Design a protein around this ligand. Sequence first.
Ligand SMILES: [Cl-]
Ligand SMILES: [Mg+2]
Lengths: 111, 231, 241, 243, 240, 195, 250, 235, 244
Amino acid sequence: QFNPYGDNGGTILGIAGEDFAVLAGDTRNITDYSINSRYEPKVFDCGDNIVMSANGFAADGDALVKRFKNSVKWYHFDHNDKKLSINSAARNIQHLLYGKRFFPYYVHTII
Amino acid sequence: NNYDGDTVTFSPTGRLFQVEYALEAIKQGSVTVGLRSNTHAVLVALKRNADELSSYQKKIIKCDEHMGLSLAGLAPDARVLSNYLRQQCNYSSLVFNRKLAVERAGHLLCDKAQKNTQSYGGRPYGVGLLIIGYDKSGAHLLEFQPSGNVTELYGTAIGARSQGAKTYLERTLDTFIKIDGNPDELIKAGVEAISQSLRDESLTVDNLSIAIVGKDTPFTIYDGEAVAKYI
Amino acid sequence: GYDRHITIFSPEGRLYQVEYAFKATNQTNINSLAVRGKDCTVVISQKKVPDKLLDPTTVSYIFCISRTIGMVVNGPIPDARNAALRAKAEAAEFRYKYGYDMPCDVLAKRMANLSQIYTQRAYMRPLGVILTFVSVDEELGPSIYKTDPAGYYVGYKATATGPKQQEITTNLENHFKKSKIDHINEESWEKVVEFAITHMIDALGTEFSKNDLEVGVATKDKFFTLSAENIEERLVAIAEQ
Amino acid sequence: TGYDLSNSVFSPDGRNFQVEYAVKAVENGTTSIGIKCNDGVVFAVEKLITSKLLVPQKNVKIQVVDRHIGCVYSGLIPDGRHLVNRGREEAASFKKLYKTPIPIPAFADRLGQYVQAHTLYNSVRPFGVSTIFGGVDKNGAHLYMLEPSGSYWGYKGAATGKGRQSAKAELEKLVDHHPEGLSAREAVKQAAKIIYLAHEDNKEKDFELEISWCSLSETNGLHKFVKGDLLQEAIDFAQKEIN
Amino acid sequence: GYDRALSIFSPDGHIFQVEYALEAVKRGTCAVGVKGKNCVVLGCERRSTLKLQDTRITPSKVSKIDSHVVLSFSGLNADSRILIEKARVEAQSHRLTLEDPVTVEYLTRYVAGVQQRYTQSGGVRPFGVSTLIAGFDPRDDEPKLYQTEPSGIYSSWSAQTIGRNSKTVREFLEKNYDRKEPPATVEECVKLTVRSLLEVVQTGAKNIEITVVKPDSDIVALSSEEINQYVTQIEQEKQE
Amino acid sequence: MDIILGIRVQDSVILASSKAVTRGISVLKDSDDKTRQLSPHTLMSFAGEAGDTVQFAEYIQANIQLYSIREDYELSPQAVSSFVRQELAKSIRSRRPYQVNVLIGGYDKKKNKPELYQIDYLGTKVELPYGAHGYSGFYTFSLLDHHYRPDMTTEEGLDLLKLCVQELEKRMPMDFKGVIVKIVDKDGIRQVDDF
Amino acid sequence: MTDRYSFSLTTFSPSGKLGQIDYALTAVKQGVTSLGIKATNGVVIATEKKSSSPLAMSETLSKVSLLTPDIGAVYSGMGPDYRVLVDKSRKVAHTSYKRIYGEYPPTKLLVSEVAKIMQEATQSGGVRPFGVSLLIAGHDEFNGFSLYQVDPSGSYFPWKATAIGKGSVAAKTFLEKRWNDELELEDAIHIALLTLKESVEGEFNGDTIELAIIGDENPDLLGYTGIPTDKGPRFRKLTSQEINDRLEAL
Amino acid sequence: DRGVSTFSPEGRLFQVEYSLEAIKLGSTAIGIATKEGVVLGVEKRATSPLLESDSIEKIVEIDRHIGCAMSGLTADARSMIEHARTAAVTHNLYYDEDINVESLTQSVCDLALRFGELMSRPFGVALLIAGHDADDGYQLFHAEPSGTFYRYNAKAIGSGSEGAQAELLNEWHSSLTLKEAELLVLKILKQVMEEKLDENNAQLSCITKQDGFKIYDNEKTAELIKELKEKEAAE
Amino acid sequence: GSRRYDSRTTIFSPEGRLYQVEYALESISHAGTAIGIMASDGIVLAAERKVTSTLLEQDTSTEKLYKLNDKIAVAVAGLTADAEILINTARIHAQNYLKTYNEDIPVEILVRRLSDIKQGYTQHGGLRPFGVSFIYAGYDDRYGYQLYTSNPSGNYTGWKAISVGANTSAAQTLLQMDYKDDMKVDDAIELALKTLSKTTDSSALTYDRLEFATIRKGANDGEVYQKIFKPQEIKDILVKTGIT
Ligand SMILES: [Cl-]
Ligand SMILES: [Mg+2]
């Protein structure tokens, strides 16, 4: 039977300072016991000083990031180029993820 | 007369009057100018107000990082068509990782406007658009009419008294086409062009609206104190 | 008077749109004729190519609906092709559903029922065509069935259609009074085609070259149209008698 | 009366006045032609230069269907584009199911049935274009002209638009003087001449010439635009003939 | 589906179909609503060209929407049944989700919204009906009386009338009703309602219906004899 | 949910319904009323799947109350039970069926007779002198076969019901936290507060 | 595109007339005369075969149609409208009756279904009424023999005997004089031929007259043997030869 | 008859232009924007003295930071308000923030042209949408049934609009206080109103950053009416 | 488009009337008169057939009087075809109610639903209304014997005695004169026939031009019987009252 999910491995890490924040992630991409790429980035600048990463199943991770980047674009169009605040981005991502509650994005997301 | 009840009816001379009446709404609209060089493309729009207490109706809309238009006529119809363009530009990016060619943008608007002129119940769009953009084949300027007719041009103008600016650009053709690598001078030529369509009123700080796109310039709009430089 | 624009009854119980669709039939100014032999059914029609720039091979009002069924149309070509395509689809579907080739008369009925719907339903206009279907049916033998914009249809011993239809009709009537039979008592289809052309020449009073005619022939298990040279061979035979 | 107010209504003559009114819109449009040749077809069109501000070579009117069919039209330009968009969908579904590219006669009927369908109801308007089109298939070269009624025929030469009678007269001479056939490269040159001669019926604004062609030998059976040296050679030939 | 825009604007800025629906209301039998200090009373005219009627089974003019709210109307009778049904369904639906019966304002607002929807929906004509909706909110002793009309506007009234010759009875109520001191008792409120109908009706026999609504779902309809006593009392005082 | 009983006597119908609402290893509530008044002289008790029970009971209640307002008339217990049965008969062949069993106890004012209907989640209706749903029946039916008489008073019916509760408290595995008892007669519905 | 005619094309005029039904009845008046006569042991329905051309084969065009083995139909008015009604009538006898009860419908109920179809064309969106009047003759076990008329409105009436179309007024008068309650089937056929001769103008023979009966069961026309309860169709179309035999003793 | 979405020869939609005539028949509504807040005021216009004037709801809350006043066929406004309220709350659900006043207005104006042969006709009501957000501050918008909206410093709509707008032209300046704006609305309403202005036939409201959208009591408005009359008599 | 040919069946006149409803009532006023009379111990339904022909099969015919269930019957005035659509709907609605509640449908409920259907055709859908007026005669255990009427507007009312169709004005005056509340069925039978006999457009009232029916409790003990009169039974009742 066809299994729609996979595990692309890797790990990510976010830390917040007083006047800054970091989002780190390794560049390795794998399937089972093979390496697919030694340099495949999964931490992205999404605009409005928001960095994002969706680690787990890379297909679902890329799909989510792509949708969020697109969400930021349409937020500008619909609300007079207003800057999307980090708290507003987070809530927007909740609705993206929960929209697929019964066929989930297999990822642990950090912004 | 008897053949202007709806868009589905031809006149005895082969005319679509509802399309011509939609064309008339553009002539009533405020003037807007478009012009380009080889490196940049510029939109200049005269905004209109209800009275001194009101704001000035925004004429220019952004579609993507590399494309946008100015409007003249029914503003809600411009919002529908610009929204459609935003989606088509966006579809090209997400699916093909490809910036939508300005020529294809025109083709898509033409086909959208056409379907409204051949079916019962619907109506033609009541707005004209001037699309500028920079893509893989350089700078572009389009003129959209709600009949469906889209035209690629070096420069043009639509709205009330647009013939003044259109004549000026027809004279200045050889000059402004070679304003390469100089944004401010191309805008100046556009501001001087729209000035040929002015009567009694002059260009003030909250009246003028300018937009630009080019080689190393995303589509950006200038209003308020940012256009004071060009008065 | 909107009762003349759509297919609803007028005060005198008439459908004017149907009657005006009948007048569209003669818009092409072409006369057709159909007759039956012993083994065959022949249909002939005038071919007029006025423009010199036209490709004369593409100018045709005879259609091959199925392998066995042929159809000639009297009316404008857009409506003619509309009817032809639909008849082809119906004939093909019939074979698939019921496991045997659609008979000429059954297809005529089906197309007539479709024509009837346009006379009752408002949104659909009638087609301005008269469809003459011909075949050698495996049960009924040589068959001619004809459909019109009213949704009427009937079988024929022979028939004619067009502006000068009445002259051709009476010409044929007088022959069957004389011969005392329902068909052309002839062995080969070649001589039945010769009969058809001869009696059209007498009725219309005009002479024909090879490019002035268009001929369709139905035999057992196939319907086919004749080329210019096949007609020329046929015209030579008439002349030498 | 009132028989001309609604589409799909028969007049007492047996005519659809709305379709005849659409023909008037076609007659108003610019001139376009089609020439059938030895092993292919040639298309050409008149593009009126309304203003100096029009970018030359960048308002293309001739359209390609699939890779082997060319379409050109006169009248309401948007209506023509709508018809070509349908043509492309029809040609795509034919190739999808039957593998082979759509034959020209098959393609002609697909447009013909679609245009004819727009004369059957009062909820739609007839097409405001006459469309000249054709190409090369397994059986050779074919040229077709389609009208607002849905009527189409095969042609040796075709012409429509404001200068149709002038172009038809010039086409009839070519058919008479070349019974054995006209070559592809010749047909391109003749096409240029006929557009220039047909421009006499639209001579207020000067114009821009645009030519395309399909040929089994010259273009390998595919539709291509005539550009550069071959275009300028055809323009010069046409310029020499008017003087 | 039938799509036609029947309700549309005219050059002078009027929606004629809505205005013609008001004419149907003006044709209908008179209906009056008067609210007192501790009650509301709904009075209704019944035309006397119909004898040989069966009043047991004939649809009553005042309809219960719930145990605590009532609805009378003027205009097309068949149209009114549709509004009453919809209102009754919404009343039970509100009890089911909010666990509380509707307020009179809420019920009115719903009925008014339905009427409005039929003024800008394709394929439909407006309701040829105006309603008087009266009652008491749950656990509340303040009387409520509202009016609706075909356009969809609604508002609260101390006292109001609708239907044929309603402008005459409104004239009567405008001078006879004191805002500072409404009818203190049930008798006073019923009498003022009957008096107001007697300006228009004809005879006070089987032409007047009276329904009294009191707090906590206390609704009762008066009989012929009970109403006839008010008619007899008013006429004797009049001769002065 | 679990225990719902019904006894029809001479002049009334008595419904007893357990007060416990359990989930997992926790009794969440011990005062739950597993009944709804459908009309002034008709009461329905219910038991089954969590959520479904109350959702179904309230849905039926709304429909009967709507009928009452529309016609200004109370439906007979027979008519209400037939309506309820049909709803359950539809439900059983749905995508997700209501897993709810009910007893309908009512007093017919036209006949001047008490009536008790037992309907399961499949839509299986029966009129009975005494009824029960779930495991309760395995004890109470045989008990009532012995002690029940058709001409008993309401007070005799309550003592007969006490005898059932005592037996269930003795032999049932689960603690059902006693019962709420309600009487349906000519004067309507009332609750016995001390049981 | 799409059928935008979702509204009635038949409406009440100020005088209370339904114009399109009246006009449909006018179309029936223009149509060729047809008739029906009920006997004690059968029913006869007949009409003239108006040939459009002498080259046309009038055998191929059937004005009298079998609906069920025991029910037949004939019309006056528009032939195409009749043809589709016969198709629909045959199908409805199966879908709404035979596929449910395993037997053919009685005459009155099949008539009722045809009427329903014709009524809907009077009220539904974007359609005109049917331009025909039908005469339906039939037999069933519990009602015996029966004859019905169906008009464009969808109204239907049972008749002892009647006529519709061109010369119906004169034909009905003729039938009133001749009809009695003791008529045998052969006597009714004889009267039908006499009545029809009055309205027919040109040739009067078995090739220009179409006539069918609802009489005794016909085991020979069943097509199989072995089931005793199945005894054959009561509907029989009289041949060209069978009509001419009765025209000699006329 | 003729199509609902038909253009006139002058290039305007017939139905939209006719709806504008309906709005002119409506009761007067005035809005004034200041740096201390935006004030909204309306003429109630009771058709009869028996009608309880406090039930006339022509000023309405959309969210805590956005208010709305209407004029014309006020029944048509109910679904527009319903949409506005849902849009505002829905945006707060999706983005955990207050929605911009302009974005709200644009969402309401998208309904306007969704008519034809969607609803059967345009709205017969104009709206004054007043509010505050962090980006563009205190704002006043005029939303029409054409689908167009203009921002205004001050605006009057309804039967006395052209007369009131000419009065607002002279009186408005960029340094108006809230108290000055309250009196100005009352002053201009009293001029254009048929009946004499009081607390029962006119209603005031405002929106401030601190307290949000508030409809004024009849007691509070009455004191502002009394304060207004004294100030005009004082010179 | 198609707008051109739309009659607009569901609109108001400037006076506030529904054109198509008013014209449908004008149609019904030419139909054969139908009378309903309610007595204390039963109900009478009488109706005049529209200009009969001598060759019309009278015994196996149904034009005016139709059975909805065992307890309810209707008399028709208008288009028969239209009435039969509504009758089959009413017959189904009665069986739905019986299936749901295991009780025969109350008369008013059936009448209301049938009247609500007619109402719908006047407010939406763009179709012509049903050109039919009904007289409902029925019994239930709540209100006993009941007479109702409904018309194309979808408005219904209850009656002690009522007429529909032709000459209702004259017929209603005669009923209003001779009717009283303590009346028996046999007396009501006589009144119904006498009224038709005077209001008829025919020369003389005969058995072959009439349909007749009674709803009595004349069965055995506490149960209702519907009697649709046969031709010979109408002949006898016409002689018994002394009309022929
Ligand atoms: Cl068919
Ligand atoms: Mg059970």
